[PDB]
Enzyme design. Structure first.
Site, PDB file in Angstrom:
ATOM      1  N   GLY A 266      46.910 -24.018  22.305  1.00  0.00           N
ATOM      2  CA  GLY A 266      46.632 -25.389  22.787  1.00  0.00           C
ATOM      3  C   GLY A 266      45.280 -25.466  23.489  1.00  0.00           C
ATOM      4  O   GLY A 266      45.073 -26.187  24.508  1.00  0.00           O
TER       5      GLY A 266
ATOM      6  N   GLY B 155      42.554 -28.906  24.550  1.00  0.00           N
ATOM      7  CA  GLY B 155      42.705 -29.978  25.494  1.00  0.00           C
ATOM      8  C   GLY B 155      41.938 -29.759  26.775  1.00  0.00           C
ATOM      9  O   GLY B 155      41.011 -28.955  26.865  1.00  0.00           O
ATOM     10  N   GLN B 156      42.390 -30.447  27.792  1.00  0.00           N
ATOM     11  CA  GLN B 156      41.733 -30.454  29.060  1.00  0.00           C
ATOM     12  C   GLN B 156      41.522 -29.107  29.710  1.00  0.00           C
ATOM     13  O   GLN B 156      40.404 -28.801  30.122  1.00  0.00           O
ATOM     14  CB  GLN B 156      42.500 -31.334  30.032  1.00  0.00           C
ATOM     15  CG  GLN B 156      41.788 -31.499  31.368  1.00  0.00           C
ATOM     16  CD  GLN B 156      42.502 -32.456  32.260  1.00  0.00           C
ATOM     17  OE1 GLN B 156      43.320 -33.240  31.783  1.00  0.00           O
ATOM     18  NE2 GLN B 156      42.196 -32.424  33.567  1.00  0.00           N
TER      19      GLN B 156
ATOM     20  N   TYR C 115      59.647 -33.903  30.664  1.00  0.00           N
ATOM     21  CA  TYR C 115      58.573 -32.922  30.895  1.00  0.00           C
ATOM     22  C   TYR C 115      58.929 -31.921  31.980  1.00  0.00           C
ATOM     23  O   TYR C 115      58.941 -30.698  31.745  1.00  0.00           O
ATOM     24  CB  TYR C 115      57.275 -33.639  31.305  1.00  0.00           C
ATOM     25  CG  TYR C 115      56.096 -32.783  31.738  1.00  0.00           C
ATOM     26  CD1 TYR C 115      55.697 -31.636  31.030  1.00  0.00           C
ATOM     27  CD2 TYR C 115      55.338 -33.158  32.802  1.00  0.00           C
ATOM     28  CE1 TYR C 115      54.593 -30.885  31.453  1.00  0.00           C
ATOM     29  CE2 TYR C 115      54.255 -32.432  33.225  1.00  0.00           C
ATOM     30  CZ  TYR C 115      53.877 -31.317  32.544  1.00  0.00           C
ATOM     31  OH  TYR C 115      52.801 -30.647  33.018  1.00  0.00           O
TER      32      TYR C 115
ATOM     33  N   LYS D 151      59.869 -27.744  32.029  1.00  0.00           N
ATOM     34  CA  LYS D 151      59.013 -26.830  32.682  1.00  0.00           C
ATOM     35  C   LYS D 151      59.824 -25.987  33.642  1.00  0.00           C
ATOM     36  O   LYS D 151      59.513 -24.809  33.869  1.00  0.00           O
ATOM     37  CB  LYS D 151      57.893 -27.574  33.383  1.00  0.00           C
ATOM     38  CG  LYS D 151      56.844 -28.048  32.423  1.00  0.00           C
ATOM     39  CD  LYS D 151      56.040 -26.902  31.836  1.00  0.00           C
ATOM     40  CE  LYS D 151      54.774 -27.343  31.087  1.00  0.00           C
ATOM     41  NZ  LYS D 151      53.985 -26.156  30.591  1.00  0.00           N
TER      42      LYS D 151
HETATM   43  N1  LIG Z   1      46.179 -31.344  33.057  1.00  0.00           N
HETATM   44  C1  LIG Z   1      46.880 -31.156  34.190  1.00  0.00           C
HETATM   45  O1  LIG Z   1      46.520 -31.700  35.369  1.00  0.00           O
HETATM   46  C2  LIG Z   1      48.095 -30.201  34.178  1.00  0.00           C
HETATM   47  C3  LIG Z   1      48.844 -30.112  35.338  1.00  0.00           C
HETATM   48  C4  LIG Z   1      49.934 -29.269  35.405  1.00  0.00           C
HETATM   49  C5  LIG Z   1      50.310 -28.503  34.289  1.00  0.00           C
HETATM   50  N2  LIG Z   1      49.566 -28.570  33.117  1.00  0.00           N
HETATM   51  C6  LIG Z   1      49.977 -27.760  31.957  1.00  0.00           C
HETATM   52  O2  LIG Z   1      48.801 -27.114  31.467  1.00  0.00           O
HETATM   53  C7  LIG Z   1      48.907 -27.024  30.023  1.00  0.00           C
HETATM   54  C8  LIG Z   1      47.705 -27.700  29.263  1.00  0.00           C
HETATM   55  O3  LIG Z   1      47.475 -29.061  29.741  1.00  0.00           O
HETATM   56  P1  LIG Z   1      46.231 -29.997  29.338  1.00  0.00           P
HETATM   57  O4  LIG Z   1      45.940 -30.739  30.579  1.00  0.00           O
HETATM   58  O5  LIG Z   1      45.175 -29.209  28.640  1.00  0.00           O
HETATM   59  O6  LIG Z   1      46.942 -30.900  28.265  1.00  0.00           O
HETATM   60  P2  LIG Z   1      46.234 -31.402  26.922  1.00  0.00           P
HETATM   61  O7  LIG Z   1      47.117 -32.339  26.287  1.00  0.00           O
HETATM   62  O8  LIG Z   1      44.903 -31.902  27.345  1.00  0.00           O
HETATM   63  O9  LIG Z   1      46.051 -30.168  25.903  1.00  0.00           O
HETATM   64  C9  LIG Z   1      47.197 -29.769  25.064  1.00  0.00           C
HETATM   65  C10 LIG Z   1      46.888 -29.076  23.725  1.00  0.00           C
HETATM   66  O10 LIG Z   1      48.092 -28.709  22.970  1.00  0.00           O
HETATM   67  C11 LIG Z   1      47.799 -28.852  21.635  1.00  0.00           C
HETATM   68  N3  LIG Z   1      49.089 -28.824  20.866  1.00  0.00           N
HETATM   69  C12 LIG Z   1      50.017 -29.790  20.781  1.00  0.00           C
HETATM   70  N4  LIG Z   1      51.053 -29.406  20.024  1.00  0.00           N
HETATM   71  C13 LIG Z   1      50.799 -28.166  19.627  1.00  0.00           C
HETATM   72  C14 LIG Z   1      51.470 -27.249  18.821  1.00  0.00           C
HETATM   73  N5  LIG Z   1      52.616 -27.538  18.257  1.00  0.00           N
HETATM   74  N6  LIG Z   1      50.934 -26.043  18.580  1.00  0.00           N
HETATM   75  C15 LIG Z   1      49.779 -25.750  19.146  1.00  0.00           C
HETATM   76  N7  LIG Z   1      49.085 -26.583  19.891  1.00  0.00           N
HETATM   77  C16 LIG Z   1      49.568 -27.805  20.159  1.00  0.00           C
HETATM   78  C17 LIG Z   1      47.165 -30.242  21.697  1.00  0.00           C
HETATM   79  O11 LIG Z   1      46.389 -30.500  20.509  1.00  0.00           O
HETATM   80  C18 LIG Z   1      46.233 -30.145  22.891  1.00  0.00           C
HETATM   81  O12 LIG Z   1      44.930 -29.700  22.465  1.00  0.00           O
HETATM   82  C19 LIG Z   1      50.189 -27.753  29.669  1.00  0.00           C
HETATM   83  O13 LIG Z   1      51.254 -26.849  29.846  1.00  0.00           O
HETATM   84  C20 LIG Z   1      50.390 -28.676  30.811  1.00  0.00           C
HETATM   85  O14 LIG Z   1      51.785 -28.980  30.896  1.00  0.00           O
HETATM   86  C21 LIG Z   1      48.460 -29.437  33.063  1.00  0.00           C
END
Ligand SMILES: NC(=O)c1ccc[n+]([C@@H]2O[C@H](COP(=O)([O-])OP(=O)(O)OC[C@H]3O[C@@H](n4cnc5c(N)ncnc54)[C@H](O)[C@@H]3O)[C@@H](O)[C@H]2O)c1
Ligand SMILES: NC(=O)c1ccc[n+]([C@@H]2O[C@H](COP(=O)([O-])OP(=O)(O)OC[C@H]3O[C@@H](n4cnc5c(N)ncnc54)[C@H](O)[C@@H]3O)[C@@H](O)[C@H]2O)c1
Lengths: 319, 319
Positions: free
Chosen positions: B7, B10-11, B142, B146
């Site tokens: 993944g 993403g962010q 969600y 988790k």
């Molecule tokens: N952004 C935050 O503030 C935050 C906070 C707490 C926890 N998290 C956790 O950190 C992790 C990443 O978050 P993020 O902010 O980058 O979210 P995001 O949505 O920006 O990135 C997620 C990535 O997962 C990819 N993806 C989706 N389905 C998939 C699959 N089946 N196989 C492979 N890849 C797949 C998506 O294309 C995306 O690029 C996640 O577990 C999120 O729950 C994020």
């Protein structure tokens, strides 16, 4: 009440299915399990007892759609000991079947019962008079999946208004059907190994106290929680208990009841570390208060009945 | 030190994957995602970028087998707002990808990081300086997934000895990604709005405090924890936080920097009830004490960085 039971052919289901047929009318109860009952099973030959794999979501929806249940007791899981040896099957059954049941309850307006367990707890729970609300850190995959079960049901309650209800069952003792690969199975094998008089080898260590309960009290609560007006329920999941014992205490109780000096060889088993990560007792005040959970049997009454019943139903030495 | 990210686009996965290529050499790092990088995506073109749907265990294994990671950050998940509206998807991804990840960590002996979140906590967690061990009652699917992620990974560590590491992430701010209608993305909408001198439409209530962290500190931390000697890790799951702000504090921070007024209209969006059920701040002292979690940016620092970086990356107006 039109009631459906899944996982019916097991320890709980067996006595549950009979008590529901008896109380509500064999017509108002439909029941089902992945296997077909064998020749000697108490529900064998009885109408309204289907073959249904809860992982076949289309089959599950079709049974429900046809029967139009208003209650559902969803009982299949893989339990503690066996889950640690077959964890892929436990993740499958305990997560995926649970998910399909919550969705069918939502889609078709079913009050749905899913048992949790004292296996949801682990070593940070507060093992003496464990509260309904505490740290959850189970150390078996079983308990893990059941914490999910509890939270996932409660979310369906909050999110869709699905009338989800559950109790954390403790060790449940019965004579009819031998248990399905958990740690509390020792108790029931002791009762048998007293009857046949052969050396009971007990996997659980002698002073490991666990919350336990005899099946008729268990049957009474399963119905009672499901009879209750939703307004009386302060929460979705509740601790219930009968009383706590250790294997040395069951040994003693059966030792009274029979007038014999029966043999137990405490050869520790996988069940032991499992049991030790469990509470010694629960606080079930909130169930007593909300919907009137009550026990009649103590450990001595249980042995009386048990040694009296296995011979009838199974055909081991009597008197 | 060899590294798989899933993944990765993403962010978090964009600024993690660039940090890791730098620190450990681009030949040590493999990044994957279900989607290809956009041409304007920082990772466009680059060597070491793969396309994997983690729902397919056979492809995950293949990639894992071809590459041979010592480490894995497994990042894909559907978060809180989108999860409520698409629970089927959240349950498949958040549960099943996690499952296949831990299994490959087991089978091919990989150190595995899976982030949890403050969204695993609910209204009974103790909202002020929330502890690492507390009651976990998530108001979102969600959040529910988790928790399961925390417990299934902790169980993998005890059962098979998998080196499972995790932190509960606060709200995460970065310029490198656009203002999507997520839970904490009001913060990021308020920057773009502020440079654009539009009005901000903030779905989160003006004095809703939340644990937050600026990406710099997150990438530092996500590596510090995975570099740690196992024996230092007293637990599998740690709270980390940067600092807590509310929308009104974030407003006073932007305006100190612009030396203008910028006007924010506060409404109800879906994010509000979700963020209300989350804590106000976290106790991360276990993470400080075991592995030296540290924070450099405060709220004014962060705002100054974001004000600069956004026009740069997205074409927007500036100073
Ligand atoms: N952004 C935050 O503030 C935050 C906070 C707490 C926890 N998290 C956790 O950190 C992790 C990443 O978050 P993020 O902010 O980058 O979210 P995001 O949505 O920006 O990135 C997620 C990535 O997962 C990819 N993806 C989706 N389905 C998939 C699959 N089946 N196989 C492979 N890849 C797949 C998506 O294309 C995306 O690029 C996640 O577990 C999120 O729950 C994020
Ligand atoms: N008996 C106890 O001490 C106890 C304690 C706590 C909780 N429980 C709960 O009660 C429920 C049942 O307990 P039990 O002891 O009766 O179980 P059991 O193992 O005796 O019975 C389980 C039944 O599930 C059926 N089954 C398995 N997979 C199935 C599937 N995919 N589709 C349909 N049926 C399937 C099996 O045929 C079996 O009859 C479980 O949720 C368990 O966690 C039991």
């Amino acid at each position: 009440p039109r009631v459906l039971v899944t996982g019916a052919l097991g320890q709980i289901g067996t006595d549950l299915s009979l008590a529901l047929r008896d109380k509500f009318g064999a017509d108002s109860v439909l029941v089902s399990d992945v296997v077909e009952p064998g020749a000697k099973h108490p529900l064998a030959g009885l109408k309204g007892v289907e073959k249904l794999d809860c992982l076949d979501s289309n089959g599950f929806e079709k049974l429900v759609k046809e029967f139009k249940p208003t209650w559902m007791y969803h009982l299949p899981a893989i339990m503690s000991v066996r889950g640690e040896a077959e964890p892929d099957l436990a993740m499958d059954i305990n997560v995926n079947t649970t998910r399909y049941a919550l969705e069918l309850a939502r889609k078709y307006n079913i009050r749905i019962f899913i048992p949790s367990t004292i296996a949801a707890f682990g070593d940070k729970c507060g093992k003496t008079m464990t509260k309904d609300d505490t740290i959850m850190n189970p150390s078996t995959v079983y308990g893990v999946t059941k914490v999910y079960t509890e939270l996932l049901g409660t979310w369906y309650r909050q999110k869709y208004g699905v009338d989800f209800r559950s109790v954390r069952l403790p060790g449940i003792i019965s004579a009819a059907t031998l248990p399905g690969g958990g740690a509390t199975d020792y108790a029931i094998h002791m009762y048998h190994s007293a009857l046949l008089q052969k050396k009971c080898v007990c996997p659980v260590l002698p002073y490991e106290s666990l919350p336990m309960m005899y099946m008729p009290d268990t049957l009474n609560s399963l119905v009672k929680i499901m009879e209750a007006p939703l307004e009386k329920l302060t929460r979705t999941v509740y601790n219930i208990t009968g009383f706590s014992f250790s294997p040395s205490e069951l040994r003693f109780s059966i030792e009274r009841c029979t007038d014999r000096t029966i043999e137990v060889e405490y050869v520790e088993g996988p069940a032991q570390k499992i049991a030790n990560s469990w509470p010694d007792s629960l606080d079930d005040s909130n169930a007593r208060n909300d919907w009137g959970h009550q026990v009649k049997y103590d450990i001595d009454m249980m042995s009386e009945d048990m040694l009296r019943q296995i011979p009838i139903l199974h055909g081991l030495p009597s008197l």
